Design an enzyme around this catalytic site. Structure first.
Site, short mmCIF file in Angstrom:
data_model
loop_
_atom_site.label_atom_id
_atom_site.label_comp_id
_atom_site.label_asym_id
_atom_site.label_seq_id
_atom_site.Cartn_x
_atom_site.Cartn_y
_atom_site.Cartn_z
CB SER A 1 -0.87 -0.03 1.31
OG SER A 1 -1.52 1.22 1.51
CE1 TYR B 1 -3.34 -0.19 4.40
CE2 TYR B 1 -4.30 -2.33 4.90
CZ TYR B 1 -3.89 -1.40 3.99
OH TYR B 1 -4.04 -1.70 2.66
#
Lengths: 251, 248, 255, 253
Positions: A138, A151
């Site tokens: 990401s 995350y």
């Protein structure tokens, strides 16, 4: 072109993962799908391509289930040639109000599962003298955002594990790399957008702060980049983290 | 996919530029070559893919020459759709022994040429509502090496200029990205080489963990990827192709 | 603690460069100042710290003038021990409308002057086997913003240059590093805010409006924070900081 | 400069954490030490500085024990103003030969302990509107090395975590940053070197460092404590979500 290679993609019963599997399938790979819900609309997608596909429902926060997943690929195709580590989960909260189990679950699935996947696929890659490991990380593997402690921490860990694994396989035909997407138009983001207001301004209100292009990345974009990493032109791409992000990282 | 596109590749009479222009040529783009010497051999490497190609000899340290190159593309094909800012030059000295004219030329050719090429192609890509600008930078746009003050400085500038230009075109169908190669088999590296294998390893062992070269054709394929629909939301990025150089 | 050392700060007649020179003066360094304007205020500020200061007006786009600056340091103090390459200039425009002259000036002052300062200091630092070169770069050495083609390019080049020099000096007691500030409260920045305030418009709101997009803290870095960092890098604990680019930026780069 | 502030340093019964604690104590912080083995040497080094100190043995792979460690900080001193998340563990194996057990312990200690430290200290820092959290990560939070999959993943996770916390606290007087050291001269690494049996002390340091650290010289725990102390001053007030490397040129190449 990938005929005779076998790709496994984690979290590929829909969204990004299925878009990826779809492109591998089109280029001739056999497919091991993984994910929850009905695996059958997805199996029938991949098979449209003149290929064999299977699905294992492994819950990748359980190592033994990751093992039975890789054991199914060994028995069914003789092992995984392309591993796309894609599955992920999210939880948004301030670090000091973060649920303790969300922390552990996010670390388990977004990070630990990638090390488990890689360890289980890499022997056969080396033995068969060719391999591709592609971690879908990401922008959050490169920068932070408020509320995403677990995350961003996991995705960073992936970016770093990528480098280690790209270096350890440098002198072989196995490569490991990461793709770092910004906002992707996933089934879950679509559902968000659907949940008064208007579709344009919901999507604008999502993208405006982080993503200068004000336009989503698609699964199919990411699928094509994966296929790129799997070609010969990908052979000296090693330990890299490439962002597809509409300008997110540029500012 | 690239039929009816026009690509200008700087520094494309050989090595990295030519391998790039060749890949774009196989994909069907009209090609504008640039560089020093007889353009014939590069032009045949292209023309044999069944495409129109032309060449302009512009020294890119001279700003007026850069203009003449872009003038020749617009008169020949109506504009640049795809710009690959590729030409480069090197010099190796410790920083305090680095020749001042050499600093200035490396900055002019590796950095300021990119800005000039960009600013001449952008308005036409904007008007046609489509464009790709790809800067061939270096792993040296991301990390340092000893002896390479001016080059690392230029290539870092390219990386940064790439971010600015990817941001400014973020809301258009024009993208700007960089590609950051490690060791590439160039005609100049091959000349260096001349067993040739031990030469290759001596050259790559310290910096490039794979001990294997990147090729101009690998790089052409990436450029091609970046011009495709799948590169539409790749913006202001610097993607390294480097045999593991940056991973350590 | 820096007594016996000599620091040269570029762009130190005012603002950031002056704030850095003041902290090095307070630690005991003799000061070479440089820049435009009346130098009497900067020289007075430095003198207060009980230290010797001189000023050279060198235009840093002129290599001969840079050489004259460094020549002044050698006769006056016996050479530069701490070089702070600080001088900056700015211009905002879209890439395609960025004037050619501004591209050349920004590249010349923000990047090439840094190579000239560095080439002139390094031999004497090496001969004495003690040296610090600290380049004041920018968050714009690490990321882009729209309208800033030349600055972001030059500042990125400073960050690269810093690595090369950090590397080439690794095996000696000379270091070279970069500091990368976000929004810093300068007299120029104080005018922006002041001009908003004269509109009827709260100064805090104005400062919030200016920083919100890039700088999550909503608060300025001060020239003094930066001088204190420079002094850190010049300490023994800075001995193995080498080729580094450290950001002080209220969060700019974390997102 | 730090009188009336309480610093907690994880893994500070020796090596890096102890050197960091010593510089903070010298600056006049009260100290909460933590770590395995005899705490008395570490306690004795602190007390030479004339600040109050306590030790807690918490195993940082156990969440309840880290919560006990912060309860002791609260009871003794009223809570933690300066948190240094230091404790580190290491294991070298190729990725497909890395013990699963050692993967979980490296993550737990080098990464997840940092989340727990942070979540426990940050409410008191916000209440008092002043705090510093400083994570001792590594160059391995920025780049890879072979053999180090777990450690590299964990320390990269730390550098990411630091950004989120930097951002979440940006509008307060609490900051969170990371320090990224290269090769550090620790007691353990001196045990490596002093075992080098017949050799040249100089060219053994050189051979150990040549490949990664162009300076061929160590970062010392004391250099690290001095940067920690910097990050604690008014000058570190707008250093936020950062990862500063101290590495003799490691990251520069």
């Amino acid at each position: 072109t990938l005929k005779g290679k076998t790709a496994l993609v984690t979290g590929s019963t829909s969204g990004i993962g299925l878009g990826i599997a779809q492109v591998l399938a089109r280029a001739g790979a056999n497919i091991v799908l993984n994910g929850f819900g009905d695996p059958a609309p997805a199996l029938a997608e991949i098979a449209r391509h003149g290929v064999k596909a299977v699905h294992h429902p492994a819950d990748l926060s359980d190592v033994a289930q990751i093992e039975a997943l890789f054991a199914l690929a060994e028995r069914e195709f003789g092992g995984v040639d392309i591993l796309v580590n894609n599955a992920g989960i999210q939880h948004v909260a301030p670090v000091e109000q973060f649920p303790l189990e969300s922390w552990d679950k996010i670390i388990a699935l977004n990070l630990s599962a990638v090390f488990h996947g890689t360890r289980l696929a890499l022997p056969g890659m080396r033995a068969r003298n060719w391999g591709r490991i592609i971690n879908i990380a990401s922008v959050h593997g490169l920068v932070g955002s408020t509320g995403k402690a677990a995350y961003v921490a996991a995705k960073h860990g992936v970016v770093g594990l990528t480098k280690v694994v790209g270096l350890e396989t440098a002198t072989s035909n196995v490569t490991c790399n990461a793709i770092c997407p910004g906002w992707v138009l996933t089934p879950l983001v679509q559902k968000q957008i659907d949940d008064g207001g208007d579709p344009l301004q919901a999507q604008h209100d999502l993208l405006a702060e982080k993503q200068p292009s004000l336009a989503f990345v698609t699964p199919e974009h990411l699928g094509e980049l994966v296929l790129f990493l799997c070609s010969e032109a990908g052979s000296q791409v090693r330990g890299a983290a490439w962002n597809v992000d509409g300008g997110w990282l540029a500012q």
